[PDB]
Design a protein around this ligand. Structure first.
Ligand code: A1A97
Length: 167
């Protein structure tokens, strides 16, 4: 039993809700919140900009130190950093950004990072401003993640389409 509320169950391990991931994280304080990161951990917009804003820029400060030490992530890769006031940990995961020409096949590799954590609150990787088809992202999520994932979909209209089209 966990404290996630109001989710529709899609499969044995995947759940979905129309929600602002920032507000969800502040309520649940999950062990792991997933950020839709880029390789530079520059949290400018989308989920990343919103999460970072909610941390009063502490996420960005921590991220800049991480990059200065370690260099950029790989597309499809991840790192674990602090969750600040939102969660115990933040798993920064880089899905391919179609608006940069990156290979959509890397989306499966990106979701594989979720399997290192028993339970996660997460967005749909590569959706939104990353330019991929969210229906496809949900399909890859369900077919790749084996741990318990609670997906927050910000856009209500998109949420309804994802549910109604789910196979
Ligand atoms: O990339 C996933 C998603 C893409 C868009 C959301 C609506 C239409 C497409 N972004 C978000 N998902 C959940 N909570 C969020 N809070 C701020 C941003 C955000």
């Amino acid at each position: 039993v966990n404290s996630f509320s109001g989710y529709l169950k899609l499969t044995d391990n995947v759940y979905i809700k129309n929600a602002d991931i920032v507000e969800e994280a502040k309520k649940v304080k999950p062990t792991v919140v997933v950020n839709a990161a880029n390789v530079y951990l520059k949290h400018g917009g989308g989920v990343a900009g919103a999460l970072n804003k909610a941390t009063n820029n502490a996420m960005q400060v921590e991220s800049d130190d991480y990059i200065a030490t370690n260099g950029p992530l790989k597309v499809g890769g991840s790192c674990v950093l602090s969750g600040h006031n939102l969660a115990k940990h933040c798993l920064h995961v880089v899905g391919p950004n179609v608006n940069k020409g990156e290979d959509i096949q890397l989306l499966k590799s990106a979701y594989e990072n979720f399997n290192q954590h028993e339970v996660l609150l997460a967005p749909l990787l590569s959706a939104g401003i990353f330019g991929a088809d969210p229906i496809h992202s949900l399909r890859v999520c369900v077919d790749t993640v084996r741990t318990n994932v609670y997906l927050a979909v910000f856009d209500k209209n998109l949420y309804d389409k994802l549910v109604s089209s789910f196979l």
